[PDB]
């Protein structure tokens, strides 16, 4: 766990490995992706940072006791899941914030 | 840099230390705060996590090559700043995402 600038990485999630296939009927898993990568001080353009992230990035370069801005997901999307609630009812719900579309520094 | 659950920490930022007092007339600095703290697998309630964060937290507990959800700011607020643009014009602008109100796992 350590690499260049903040970016999106591939990550398929199998519901059976995380023990969710018990309640999630479908899909069996999904391409979720994830974010990772240092948020540099010279602030990459392409990479987006909130004003706070920028302020913190700068402070960090003049004082290291303060952490750099983290590389988290900034753009997400949803996926459908057919599952069974606590009462064994079959539900088809559209779950938000499941897939990482874009990454950024925050 | 290493502590318990994700939480907000105090952080005053002096524009002179980060070399911004040159263009920012006022204020001289401000209480920005910052976020830090591990995002545990048993997922603290009070602490908020996106669906993705939850999925990633879980994966992480069954595979460590994948990073835990990061502790970033989830609720921010703005502050006013009187500054001078590139043309030496005095501007009073309300800058968004400057202050960390709440923290979370993403």
**Nearest alpha carbon to residue A83 among A19, A25, A30, A14:** A25
Q: Is B8 exposed, middle or buried (0-12, 13-18, 19+ CB in 10 A)?
A: middle
Nearest by CB: A52 against B50, B66, B100: B100
Structural domains in chain A, CATH included, are 1-106 (2.10.90.10)
Q: CA quadruple A16, A19, A23, A27: dihedral positive or negative?
A: negative
* A53 strand-pairing partners: none
Q: What is the CA radius of gyration of chain A?
A: 18
* Contact between A30 and A20 (Cβ < 8 Å): no
For residues B72 and B97, the answer to whether their CB atoms sit within 8 Å is no
8-state DSSP, B54: H
Least Cα distance to B44 among B3, B7, B8, B1 occurs for B7
Which residues of A1-105 form beta strands (DSSP E)? 7-9, 12-14, 24-26, 29-31, 34-36, 71-84, 90-105
For residue A101, how many other CB atoms are within 10 A of its CB?
11
What are B7's two structure tokens? 């939480």
Could you say which DSSP state residue B52 is in? H
Please report residues of B whose CB lies closer than 8 A to that of A76: 50, 52
Closest CB from A34, A59, A95 relative to B56: A34
A52, B98 in Cβ contact below 8 A?
yes
In angstroms, this model's resolution equals 2.7
Instruction: Note whether B106 contacts A58, CB cutoff 8 Å.
Output: no
């Amino acid at each position: 766990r350590l690499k260049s600038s903040c970016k999106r990485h591939p990550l398929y999630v199998d519901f059976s490995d995380v023990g969710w296939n018990d309640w999630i009927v479908a899909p069996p898993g999904y391409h979720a992706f994830y974010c990772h990568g240092e948020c540099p001080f010279p602030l990459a353009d392409h990479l987006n940072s909130t004003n706070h992230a920028i302020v913190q990035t700068l402070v960090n370069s003049v004082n290291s006791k303060i952490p750099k801005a983290c590389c988290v997901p900034t753009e997400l999307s949803a996926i459908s899941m057919l599952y069974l609630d606590e009462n064994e009812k079959v539900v088809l719900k559209n779950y938000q914030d499941m897939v990482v579309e874009g990454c950024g520094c925050r």
